[PDB]
Amino acid sequence: MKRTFQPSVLKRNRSHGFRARMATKNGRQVLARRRAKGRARLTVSK
């Protein structure tokens, strides 16, 4: 039936995109944790 993931790009990027993280203290802490674990990509970007 209608499942849980109905994808949208504009949605995806406003919610989790780079800039969206950088907006806030918490977000920059996420990006800190990721850079510390050494991910391939931090956020969802194209």
9 lines the binding site for RNA (CB under 7 A)? yes
Among residues 23, 33, 39, 45, the one that binds RNA under rule CB under 7 A = 23
Q: Which of 10, 37, 38, 40 binds RNA (CB under 7 A)?
A: 10
Closer residue to RNA (CB): 23 or 32: 23
11-21 burial, b if ≥16 CB within 10 A, otherwise e? eebeeebeeeb
Residue numbers of the site for RNA (CB under 7 A)? 7-10, 23-25
